[PDB]
DNA sequence: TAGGGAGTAATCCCCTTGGCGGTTAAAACGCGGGGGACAGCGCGTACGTGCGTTTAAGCGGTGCTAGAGCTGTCTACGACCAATTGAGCGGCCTCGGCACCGGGATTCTCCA
DNA sequence: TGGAGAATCCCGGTGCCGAGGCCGCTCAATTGGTCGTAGACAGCTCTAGCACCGCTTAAACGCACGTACGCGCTGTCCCCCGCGTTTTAACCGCCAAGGGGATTACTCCCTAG
């Protein structure tokens, strides 16, 4: 029974080290993660099918993020994603 | 075999690039999924998580508490223009409302 | 006749949370009507998923799916 | 307190708490009363009824906000059936 | 170039329901859009149903359930009826 | 042996084959069952017929033999069930239902 | 000499424009506005003739639907005149605001 | 400017189609503002699809996808 | 380790960019001018406040089994594959529904 | 009850452009086998939902009273409305030009297995 709990916890103890989070709040945050995942993945799939592609590349994920997230949110998200993919490629 | 370096790390991430990849691939978003795609999506998911949790801990401190709960998540998601636009049609259990009383109803 | 179990006080509290200062007495029966229509829409979908799954028990997920289907995503389950 | 002030105190009380505002057993009985029109002898997870309640209370609270603005627009401080129907009207729920 | 559309089948059905009536290219575009849209809806909901219940096949039963979720009121009952007729004719033949 | 279309075998005008292809190649599922395109074609045909019937009536009422966009708008908005199905949909050259609010009349 | 009373010709129009399918905003002003905006997102774009018409149809459909909701708000407040107030309550209850 | 090409008469006609009997002079500039916000949202998405497709021309499909993204599905194109 | 999707170069055409000139419908204006918005005021009734009694909400126990979830089998249905052919796509055909225009017959306003 | 004259509707002839249609043809849809596993089914466990029972006491509910708010009524005259009017520039019809969306062909490294 898989959940993004673990990771929510690692991020929390990175951003507010002495603060915990409740079980209910963990549930809500996990739901948040699943929802955003779904939305981005789905928009990406649509973009792919619309351009007659059959693959969801980094560039699909980027454009999905730019369609979905607003303003500064979108910009910062694009930035983080690009940084991550760059580091991955380097390694 | 050479030692197994987790992709999350290879990436400098806490989030599970591995699981994200399974979900994209086994999740029928398309016939083929690149490595880049998992990495980027995992990163974006981490960023938004970070923002929400940060604002929530800020709220929790403002109310002198050590533990992030649903009401805190809710007040965080509503005080930011961008998160409130992202989650504008989402209901958070045990979150409550933001305090708001109209002017005309206030004492005169 | 269980609808009137949604009490006048219960409706009053919800109107208070919604920032309402004074409540005309006809609101209580409108609110019951509105709530019943909303519940019927969600429960019909929840039961539809339940039947499809060949279950006899409505689960929390069936309700969460029904709410998401209607643009009222419910976080926490 | 001078009249109308206790109302603003009650509003504050209800806006700072996270508790559920409908009684659990009345709501549960309403859910089952509606359900048996769609299929008889349905069982419910305990958590499923609570999910319905949270969604239902969140819906009604949001509706009352829109209702309030309809009243205030008409230069009233009292909400009325008309205000609910306009809110439902413009939301496209009609 | 090549651009396939439902215009043929729309026209066949029109000449069964109202033989004297025709259909403009703009109206045909709308009908082509409509068929595409509701195909995407029912196929999409059937996909979700399959994924949810951990099934890998959009069977008749998924499509039936999708139809009950998507169409309002009597449209659901009639759509489910015609679908049930169609699969009965098919499987019995 | 001679080819018999699944459309005709199912008693449908709508193309069971084309619908089957689109379900496979639209990435909706790993597998598409044999009954699925038959059912979906039946439903799309039914709903096509329902709108075209009401649009044909609308055309007849306006003394024309051709369905123009206006007739599809009148067909959709005057049926509660179509208007609930297509409530958020805009139809080009459709116009609006004739509707003046009660308090505006002299 | 002859004068239809204020309100009469208005109802004549409400009948005329509710019976017609035509686009009410002239096309060229609209095309210019559509472009004028687009060049803030990407320079030297081209537009299909049909793309501008799709934008116009959607824009007119949006504004007319907004004005229906606006009208009901005015009527609720016992007015016949729509104002910023009405438009804004309409946009809010809908969800846009 | 170009937004003032959405003339007072044009806005009047649209209000008339919506059943509006009397129009305050402040409506015209509010309507222009509201229209500009709507067009910006749709064009932003349309350009986003256009860029993704590696095209320089915005197509009818890009506009239809942008509208469907925003819950305002348009039939008659595509 | 396999193999085919996609990135790329040679190629071009169709539909978009663009201009030009004439017409006229439409947009915007020089000046009057009004009816329904709004403010004020009075009154009555219905909602708020509080006080007392009734009523089941809510806690908590007990018990029971329905039914959700797992587990192992096996089959029949779908993916695939190769050959075959006819239904559907392009585009050319041709004639009739609609647009249009004018002209005449009528319903309607609003105010005498 | 009664006109001037405006907005409106109905008829009829014209003609044009697109509604309803026909010829090739090709590539997708069918036929006909093969196979292997996804899912249907049957059996079994035990979780949790249902059902019930007694008690406590928080809240609901019923009542009484009064007041302030909703609502009706009156009177004033704003800034938006309105005309014929004057101005303006879209629209229309036609034409040149060529951008970049679309096609084909190939080649290779991307991701699946």
From Swiss-Prot, chain A:
Q: Name one GO biological process term.
A: nucleosome assembly
Q: Where are the N6-methylated lysine modifications?
A: 83
Q: Which organism is it from?
A: Homo sapiens
One GO cellular component term noted in the UniProt record for this chain: extracellular exosome
State the name under which the record lists this protein: Histone H2B type 1-C/E/F/G/I
Q: How is it modified after translation?
A: Monoubiquitination at Lys-1 (H2BK34Ub) by the MSL1/MSL2 dimer is required for histone H3 'Lys-4' (H3K4me) and 'Lys-79' (H3K79me) methylation and transcription activation at specific gene loci, such as HOXA9 and MEIS1 loci. Similarly, monoubiquitination at Lys-87 (H2BK120Ub) by the RNF20/40 complex gives a specific tag for epigenetic transcriptional activation and is also prerequisite for histone H3 'Lys-4' and 'Lys-79' methylation. It also functions cooperatively with the FACT dimer to stimulate elongation by RNA polymerase II.
GO molecular function: any one?
Answer: protein heterodimerization activity
Q: Which family does it belong to?
A: Belongs to the histone H2B family.
Modified positions (N6,N6-dimethyllysine) are 24
Modified positions (Dimethylated arginine) in chain numbering: 46
Residues modified to N6,N6,N6-trimethyllysine: 52
Subunit-level organization = The nucleosome is a histone octamer containing two molecules each of H2A, H2B, H3 and H4 assembled in one H3-H4 heterotetramer and two H2A-H2B heterodimers. The octamer wraps approximately 147 bp of DNA. Interacts with VRK1; the interaction is mediated by the nucleosome acidic patch, a cluster of negatively charged residues of H2A and H2B forming a cleft within the nucleosome core.
| Main subcellular location | nucleus
* Residues carrying N6-crotonyllysine: 1
Q: Which residues carry this modification: N6-(2-hydroxyisobutyryl)lysine?
A: 1, 10, 13, 24, 52, 75, 83, 87
UniProtKB/Swiss-Prot annotation, chain C:
Glycyl lysine isopeptide (Lys-Gly) (interchain with G-Cter in ubiquitin) cross-link, chain position(s): 68
Residue numbers of Phosphotyrosine PTMs? 28, 65
Covalent link (Glycyl lysine isopeptide (Lys-Gly) (interchain with G-Cter in UFM1)) residue numbers? 8
Q: Which residues carry this modification: Phosphothreonine?
A: 57
- What are the recorded GO MF terms, alphabetically? DNA binding; protein heterodimerization activity; RNA binding; structural constituent of chromatin
Note the SS bond partners: none
Stated consequence of mutating residue 9 to A:
In TEBIVANED1
Decide whether keyword Ubl conjugation is in the record.
yes
What keywords would UniProt list here?
Answer: Acetylation, Chromosomal rearrangement, Chromosome, Citrullination, Disease variant, DNA-binding, Hydroxylation, Intellectual disability, Isopeptide bond, Methylation, Nucleosome core, Nucleus, Phosphoprotein, Ubl conjugation
State what changing residue 68 to E does: In TEBIVANED2; results in severe early developmental defects when expressed in zebrafish embryos
Q: What is the effect of changing residue 8 to R?
A: Abolished ufmylation
- Residue numbers carrying N6-lactoyllysine: 8, 54, 68
N6-propionyllysine modified-residue sites? 8, 21, 54, 56, 68
* Modified positions (Phosphoserine) in chain numbering: 24
Q: Which residues carry this modification: N6-butyryllysine?
A: 8, 21, 54, 56, 68
Which residues, renumbered to this chain, carry the PTM N6-succinyllysine?
8, 54, 56, 68
| Record's function text | Core component of nucleosome. Nucleosomes wrap and compact DNA into chromatin, limiting DNA accessibility to the cellular machineries which require DNA as a template. Histones thereby play a central role in transcription regulation, DNA repair, DNA replication and chromosomal stability. DNA accessibility is regulated via a complex set of post-translational modifications of histones, also called histone code, and nucleosome remodeling.
Which family, according to the similarity comment?
A: Belongs to the histone H4 family.
Q: How does it assemble?
A: The nucleosome is a histone octamer containing two molecules each of H2A, H2B, H3 and H4 assembled in one H3-H4 heterotetramer and two H2A-H2B heterodimers. The octamer wraps approximately 147 bp of DNA. Found in a co-chaperone complex with DNJC9, MCM2 and histone H3.3-H4 dimers. Within the complex, interacts with DNJC9 (via C-terminus); the interaction is direct. Interacts with NASP; NASP is a histone chaperone that stabilizes and maintains a soluble pool of Histone H3-H4 dimers.
Q: In its UniProt entry, what is this protein called?
A: Histone H4
Organism, by scientific name, is: Homo sapiens (Human)
From Swiss-Prot, chain D:
Q: Which residues carry this modification: N6-succinyllysine?
A: 16, 39, 82
Name of the protein: Histone H3.2
Q: Which residues carry this modification: Phosphothreonine?
A: 40, 67
Q: What are the entry keywords? A: Acetylation, ADP-ribosylation, Chromosome, Citrullination, DNA-binding, Hydroxylation, Lipoprotein, Methylation, Nucleosome core, Nucleus, Palmitate, Phosphoprotein, Ubl conjugation
Family membership noted in the UniProt record: Belongs to the histone H3 family.
Instruction: Spell out which residues are annotated as carrying N6-(2-hydroxyisobutyryl)lysine.
Output: 16, 24, 39, 82
Q: Which residues of the full protein are shown?
A: 42 to 135 of 136
The upper taxonomy is: Eukaryota, Metazoa, Chordata, Craniata, Vertebrata
Where are the Phosphotyrosine modifications? 1
Q: Which residues carry this modification: N6,N6-dimethyllysine?
A: 39
Gene behind this protein: H3C15
Sites of N6-methyllysine modification: 16, 24, 39, 82
Q: Name one GO biological process term.
A: chromatin organization
